[PDB]
């Protein structure tokens, strides 16, 4: 099928009023739009990308850290097991760690020996030659990266970083790699394997250039068909790395939208999108994550935050916390976007009131701990599992004022009557009554 193979959305900006048009924004958030390129984007806002050539990076932070994955370079859009036999969906890619200006060193030697292999002239495939990747890399320090930083802020608002129309503005803290920027420095087949967005939060990626990098993507509501391949061959959807047999996906009907990003374009990854991303050239990237106030996003983070809760994989987005801040401060005009937060609310209220009433009919103390703002969320140290309000602390953490938080399955556990434990609570059942009882739809006419 020739819808196997569907055409990219894609969009030219020319200028800055093409960037600051609002049907650009609708485009994007669109959920029939898996993906949308946004082509020559620095272009038309005159964005300084030489601010993040690798120059630039040597000179600003040499000693900054970066993770490495060393990988083998694989030919067009295929990955071959070592001995070259057949295609196969497992990766191969190890990690180390490096600097800024180790990586650097070994970004342009790598080119110049090209250049010399090129002037040098003339198992079913293979064998193939090692290559590593920087990956990962932390700007979320603005004492050390101010003037990178600041450049980002000339995006039109959807996009940015931090905007007033971001819910990972609205979860009150840092959440590093999501509401922080990450950098990649890359060399001819670098990859990032196949996955979706922590949460199904939706993304933003700038290439630097000066090469170009090859995006595949699967829409969210495939997402179920490749979990079922990586089953199948052994591997963890989630934590595995792993690179799809394109001729496995056309077999099972799966659409695949494949394209180029050139230098100064910005590709928007939506909600759940899969994807996975290779270099064709020599380039750097930049990437976020943007959290929309949709119907659609608020449904796909909360469906990912639940799976990953019986993966035993921890979620990097607090969804309890961000529900209350939502219905503390946003006027939300949405019938269908209102209906599920008020929805998971009330659950979360009901629940808390179960737990609290059969602590005290078994007459375990609940002590009044209260809460300093814009504390972060909590999360159980053995389980990772989100804990919200009533937190399980040992008789001996709660002595020394260290507060190492439990949940309440995992204390249990360990002390079958809670009696090596403590129980605190953060917010008054009156008080979270009022925020859930005072969240109403606002009007809004458009
Ligand atoms: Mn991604
Ligand atoms: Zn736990």
Known sequence: KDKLNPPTPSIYLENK??????????????????????????????????????????????????????????????????????????????????????????????????????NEKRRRKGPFKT?????????????????????????????????????????????????????????????????????????????????????????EDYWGVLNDFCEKNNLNFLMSSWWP??????????????????????????????????????????????????????????????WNKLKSVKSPVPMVHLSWNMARNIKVSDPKLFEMIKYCLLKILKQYQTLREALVAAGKEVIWHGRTNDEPAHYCSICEVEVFNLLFVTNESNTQKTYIVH????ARKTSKSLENFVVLEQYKMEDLIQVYDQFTLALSLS
């Not at 890399?137 to 000339?154: A, F, G, P, V, Y």
């Not at 970083?161 to 509401?179: D, E, F, K, P």
């Open 245 to 306: 047999n394109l001729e496995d996906l056309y077999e099972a009907n799966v659409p695949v939208y494949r394209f180029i990003q050139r230098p100064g374009d910005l590709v928007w990854i939506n909600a759940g999108t899969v994807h996975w991303v290779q270099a064709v050239g020599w380039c750097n990237n930049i990437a976020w994550n943007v959290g929309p106030l949709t119907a659609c996003q608020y449904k796909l983070a909360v469906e990912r935050y639940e």
């Open 407 to 410: 949940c309440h399955d995992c």
């Open 131 to 219: 290559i590593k990747f920087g990956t990962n890399i932390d700007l979320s320090d603005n004492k050390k990266w101010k003037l990178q930083l600041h450049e980002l802020t000339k995006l039109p608002a959807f996009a940015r970083v931090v905007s007033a129309g971001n819910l990972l503005t609205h979860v009150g803290h840092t959440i590093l790699g999501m509401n922080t920027v990450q950098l990649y420095m890359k060399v001819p087949g670098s990859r990032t394997p196949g996955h979706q967005e922590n949460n199904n939060f939706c993304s933003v990626n700038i290439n630097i250039g000066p090469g170009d990098c090859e995006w595949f993507v699967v829409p």
């Open 17 to 118: 009023r093409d960037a600051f048009f609002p049907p650009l924004h609708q485009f994007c958030t669109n959920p029939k739009n898996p993906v949308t390129v946004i082509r020559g984007l620095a272009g038309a806002l005159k964005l300084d990308l030489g601010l993040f050539s690798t120059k630039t990076l040597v000179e600003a932070n040499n000693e900054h850290m970066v993770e490495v994955r060393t990988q083998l370079l694989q030919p067009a859009d295929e990955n071959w097991d070592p001995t070259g036999t057949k295609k196969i969906w497992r990766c191969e890619s190890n990690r180390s760690h490096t600097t800024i200006a180790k990586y650097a060193q070994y970004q342009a030697s790598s080119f110049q020996e090209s250049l010399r292999e090129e």
